[PDB]
Design a protein around this ligand. Structure first.
Ligand SMILES: [Mn+2]
Lengths: 100, 9, 276
């Protein structure tokens, strides 16, 4: 069976302003099969009670999901998205970069 | 709204 | 303008872990409005947009009955497909279905859709004629023969030309505050040094709806599409979308580069430059 590895983007809903509440997003797309594990990380540790969208798919049948949580960015705190999927030999970590 | 009818493969 | 309605469905088998997981969502344009997930406590189709909340209890009852019936059909069909493909009972497999309709500005049917996929590949699709089928392989041809005998295409045509269009029109009116509003992108250009010799220019579009947008870079009026990194359009988590396009440019040459933005929310295309 043909499998497709996820694309991953990690980003904020609104332009980041240190001290101001916002949402942290991890968008996973273009993947098959649909089983996937996604965590949001604050300084390396799993954030609790992260929400996600309901599974849907693109015209090419590949799947996408949005994982999200409220967060208040600062200068020092580091955020990331950790993704596992059958196409990956170990979990992939993508760091949040406010310029991307 | 959704369709009422469907058919087995 | 023109508008679409779509229902998406995914069943994923999980041998040894109960019945398949079934998830279905409905959209009008790029707006989610209904959802159903089989792995909820006692599952019901639920509203996801304000303009659908006004539908009465009978609406939700019927929708829920249809969702549960679709799940059960898929459960049997996953078993059928193991036979058609001479597969073992050990693995997880996927069935996906989409159907729905597109209308023009006048509300008339532009195109109807109904298509199925197994394990992420085309299985069988209703053609644009709403009368004939495209089967991907000899397994799907077995389905096609059964569906020809049962005059399935004619039944789908009746739905797609009738209720699909009529209910889309209803939703567009009831949701006119949002479904009939385009939010233009908020745009700007940032500059990201790579070395003393060159830098990335990144052209941003934020807060736009619907998702369709074009972002391009030119240098001296010539498209740079081979040199442009263009990220997939991504959801902000309200209703809006985001996108950027980036080019690497030699230092001192930044004013040669223009970013061009087309979106339905904008009167005329935008042209933007880096503004130090
Ligand atoms: Mn040098």
């Amino acid at each position: 069976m043909i499998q497709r590895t996820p694309k991953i983007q990690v980003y904020s809903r609104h332009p980041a302003e240190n001290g101001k509440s916002n949402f942290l997003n991890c968008y996973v797309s273009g993947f098959h099969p649909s089983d996937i594990e996604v965590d949001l990380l604050k300084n390396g540790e799993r954030i609790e009670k992260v929400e996600h969208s309901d599974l849907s798919f693109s015209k090419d049948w590949s799947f996408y999901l949005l994982y999200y949580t409220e967060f208040t960015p600062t200068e020092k705190d580091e955020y990331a998205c950790r993704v596992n999927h059958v196409t990956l030999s170990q979990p992939k970590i993508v760091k949040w970069d406010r310029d991307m | 709204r959704r369709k009422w009818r469907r058919w087995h493969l | 303008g023109s508008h679409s309605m779509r229902y998406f469905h995914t069943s994923v088998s999980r041998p040894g872990r109960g019945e398949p997981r079934f998830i279905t969502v409905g959209y009008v344009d790029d707006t989610l409005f209904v959802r159903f997930d089989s792995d909820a406590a006692s599952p019901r189709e639920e509203p996801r947009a304000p303009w659908i909340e006004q539908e009465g209890p009978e609406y939700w009852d019927r929708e829920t009955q249809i969702c549960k019936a679709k799940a059960q059909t898929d459960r049997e069909d996953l078993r059928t497909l193991l036979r058609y493909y001479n597969q073992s009972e050990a693995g997880s497999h996927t069935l996906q279905n989409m159907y729905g309709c597109d209308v023009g500005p006048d509300g008339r049917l532009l195109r109807g859709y109904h298509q199925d996929a197994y394990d992420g590949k085309d299985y069988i699709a209703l053609n644009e004629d709403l009368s004939s089928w495209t089967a991907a392989d000899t397994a799907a041809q077995i389905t096609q023969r059964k569906w020809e005998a049962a005059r399935v295409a004619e039944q789908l045509r009746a739905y797609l030309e009738g209720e699909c269009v009529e209910w889309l029109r209803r939703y567009l009116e009831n949701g006119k505050e949002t479904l009939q509003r385009a939010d233009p992108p908020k745009t700007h250009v940032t500059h990201h040094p790579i070395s003393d010799h060159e830098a990335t220019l990144r052209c941003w579009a934020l807060g736009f709806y619907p998702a369709e947008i074009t972002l391009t870079w030119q240098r001296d009026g010539e498209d740079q599409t081979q040199d442009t990194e263009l990220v997939e359009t991504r959801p902000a988590g309200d209703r809006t979308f985001q996108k950027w396009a980036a080019v690497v440019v030699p230092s001192g040459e930044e004013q040669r580069y223009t970013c061009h933005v087309q979106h339905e929310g904008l009167p005329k295309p935008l042209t933007l430059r880096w503004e130090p």
